[PDB]
């Protein structure tokens, strides 16, 4: 039952295990849909989720709002090839874009019909990208 999905990192203020990074991004991208679909309080989350939410701004800086709106329309075509994302700004923009897409779906009353549709998280979260992300988050959250 999607209503009863569990979010293990939602109240965390820290992350300090690289082996949790994929789980965290997977959950967080689901949460940006779920929080709209079930009208949960978007403010009831910890510093870790708040840091990830700032990647919305990174995506806007990187793409601009028109291209964002375009990419979201396309996905809802995989505009972004996760296997081609190899630097910090591109990585954070891509996480931001994924959050915008699943949030947008929630605004449109779309959820389960688009599960397993974004592409392979393991293509995005190479070991280097995992390291980029966790070092960044530790520096912000230390």
């Amino acid at each position: 039952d999607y209503e009863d999905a569990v979010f293990y990192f939602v109240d965390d203020d820290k992350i300090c295990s690289r082996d949790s990074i994929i789980d965290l991004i997977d959950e967080y991208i689901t949460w940006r849909n779920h929080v709209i679909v079930f009208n949960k309080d978007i403010t009831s989350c910890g510093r870790l989720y708040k840091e990830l939410m700032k990647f919305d701004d990174v995506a806007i800086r990187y793409y601009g709002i028109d291209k964002i709106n375009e990419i979201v329309e396309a996905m809802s075509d995989h505009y972004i090839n996760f296997t081609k994302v190899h630097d910090q700004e591109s990585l954070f923009a891509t996480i931001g874009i994924c959050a915008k897409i699943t949030e947008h779906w929630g605004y449109k009353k779309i959820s389960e019909s688009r599960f397993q549709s974004l592409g392979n998280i393991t293509d995005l979260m190479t070991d280097d990208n995992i390291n980029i992300l966790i070092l960044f988050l530790e520096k912000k959250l230390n």
Partner: peptide, 9 residues
Amino acid sequence: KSSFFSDRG
């Protein structure tokens, strides 16, 4: 767990 990613859930 469910997921929006194709290689998860």
